[model samples]
Target: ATLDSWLSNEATVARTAILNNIGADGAWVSGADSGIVVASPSTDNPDYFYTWTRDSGLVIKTLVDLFRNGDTDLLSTIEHYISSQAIIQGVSNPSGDLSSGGLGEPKFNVDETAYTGSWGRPQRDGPALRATAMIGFGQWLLDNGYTSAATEIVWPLVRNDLSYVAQYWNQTGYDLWEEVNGSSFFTIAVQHRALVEGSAFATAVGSSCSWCDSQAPQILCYLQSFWTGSYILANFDSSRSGKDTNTLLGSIHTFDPEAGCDDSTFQPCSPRALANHKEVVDSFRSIYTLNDGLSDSEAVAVGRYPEDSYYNGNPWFLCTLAAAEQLYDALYQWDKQGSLEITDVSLDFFKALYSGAATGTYSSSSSTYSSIVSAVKTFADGFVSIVETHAASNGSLSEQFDKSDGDELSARDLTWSYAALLTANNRRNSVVPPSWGETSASSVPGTCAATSASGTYSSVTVTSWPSIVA
Candidate 1:
């Protein structure tokens, strides 16, 4: 089957994976509040049976994306999710009071109850990401004339999250993977985008957040510190090494068509971001047997990081697809701008891949753009091809695949994995407006909170935002 056919066929399965685990009053459990589990029938290696704010946010964001694309049938699902989140926002968890920026619990019971498990605490990214997802539906609500629901219900939850982001962005918390205890690129990326857009959402309603206004630029400045002059560091802490899928997801999370390239934020298709992308893909190229001797145009499987040992450190379906999704967005940006240029940094990838044939400065010529686009598209499809090869014939996606041999392992029917596949396929197959609308400048109107922050990163080549492509 063609890529489109494969994606179309699997879309249902992906949707089912999400719906099957969603909370509804049933034989399985009670409190039918519409929260979703990360995976059902919990696997011991990664017991993902509980509802994660981060995973559910992204999954619902995907459903919202489909709803925006004329899939009006998903409206009820989105509604259920919105109401569930409203209740979730109200419930007290380990995060303390609602105003405390402590709504950072990593996961909750599938029945929408607070989880008592001893696990990572204060995953600061969850509330920011959840708020962003809620904002998407909020916009949809406003557009569809559900003004009271949008403002009265959704905006309040979003406001509290924005308050959390502005207040606690400087503090350290667990990263998105619920591993590591330092500042994370994925966490900050979503936080940055949330604050940037959150301010706008606040203004659209009859409100304004003085804190979001004050601290967003500070977050942006801190965001600039992640680049390491070569690849984006997954975390700022010095102990870790190797490329991470966090950077890939960071770029995707911060993608904006109206914005220009910035190494700091690693906007999609930026030269620095492309450099990070190349590093991530190349890092896995020789390590995974699945990528053995693959050509430059071929897509390879990707894992979380080189040092990861969870489930014996295997490639992840979501990470590999995230690489593809990034490239698709890059190609979309290049097409929109009507030109593509290769910088010294981005050229390093092609040089390393193609045996150092050229030195800096490559641009798309009349014939070259088509070939480059086609090749990149093929590369994107190659990742999907890897996914299709290992996926269950019924289209189920697990957490990780074996490193040496491509056998599925770890959590089964992983909701995040399915969401990644659906979004990646959607990106590759068609044009969809970004779920979050155009990103704005830090219109927060205040000085950055950290003056010495960028100065401390002298080793990293942090540059101002690049000129916008026209």
Candidate 2:
């Protein structure tokens, strides 16, 4: 069947798969894991049924959203999900860290974490992603008047994770690619949000988020450095060149493949790989432009070096969507901050979109302004289309797909992918003005001003069951 055909029963199929795979213990297992759930559900090879924090969070997030959007039955599923997360946190993987967030990365890729080190190991984004999902649920709990439950269960875990990110936000770990290279833009981006949003969450409930507030601007300022010339450099130093930078650019759908890049070289200014750079920012933009195409498909996206291990240069859903969603968010922020104008770059984007499909040529007559707008919208559609088509009809996510064949390829069910999709959808529907429109970063705290968050956030306390700590 074609992609459209595959998606026809996609949600139903995904729901079935999700339900069957969830074990009696509220955990899912890979067919290969030491458990069985509804017979492992997938016909292709083996199905991943394991209860990974990341995967579980993704599934739960969707269920939560579905619930918010009027799917009440999912409320129990969500409760089980939170309980499952609590359980996974205690899985004992050597990290000495609870909140297992589900396991996978540390198993395939070694030299990163102690799990198994098979592939995509020890990714640092899990905590931040898990934090985002939990925060969403917590907010929902409060929104639905389940304050007691939210504070008792959701808040403690969310608080601990927020604390983890707040303390470790600056540390260098594996990129989302799971490579133990230098610091990464992706990691920082998510961390920045976790801190910023986490703090806002605190303030929303009438609590003093002095902590989140203290760190938010620091991370924001740090993130600004990524704009070396036109785009962001992949990593902090030149070690990985701008791989992470390029990856971010590509992810946001701002990447232009025509830009040159030397993924191996240590050019912090502008590496020569995707498109050659005449200037710093433009060069970054070029790489971002090119990478956006592959953001949805790693099989076709340029692989890192052959020597690179983590998932073999796979095009990650979250990574790709991050580029798009972040850019949109950035644009939203800019608009909120009053910085985004009808610029040439924005116009060129529209021009490219007006030009044609991936294969279609740009129209000479189309205004560059219109073209740029067209480009962004078109790319957004492309990115969303992939998720809409490939994601289980119920909105479940997996890792990567074979770009050439459109087959669901990697990871059984990934969390961030769904996060990216939901976040993107939220961005698209946001009623708030863009970030550039006179909106100060300071306003984020107000999100919690009326809510009374006192004693809701966790401090340094480590408890067996959930408890609000000082």
Which candidate's lDDT is highest?
1
Give the Å error, residue 392, model 1. Answer: 0.5
Whole-model lDDT, candidate 2? 0.45
Candidate 1, residues 18-103, lDDT tens digits: the string is 77767672222343455444444453556666778888788887887887778776766666676676666666678764554347
Clashes of each: 0, 110
Displacement of the residue 412 alpha carbon in candidate 1, Å: 0.4
Candidate 1: global Cα-lDDT? 0.73
Model 2 bad stretches (over 4 Å): 1-21, 25-51, 87-92, 97-122, 204-207, 241-340, 344-351, 354-375, 383-399, 403-470
Which tens-of-lDDT digit does each residue in 1-470 have in candidate 2?
34334434444455545555555532443332211122233435443333344444445555555566665655555555556455444444644444333321332111122343245445555666666667777787677676766666776666666655656566565665445555676566566556666776666565545656666666656655565543356677545446443344233322111211112121111222112122222322323233344422121222232224444334445544543454354334333333223323233332233443232322334444344444554554455565565555455666665444434556655434444555455554432211111123422232222111111223223233333221
Each prediction's TM-score versus the true structure? 0.89, 0.61
Off by over 4 Å in 1: 25-32, 43-45, 295-297, 352-365, 435-439, 442-448, 451-470
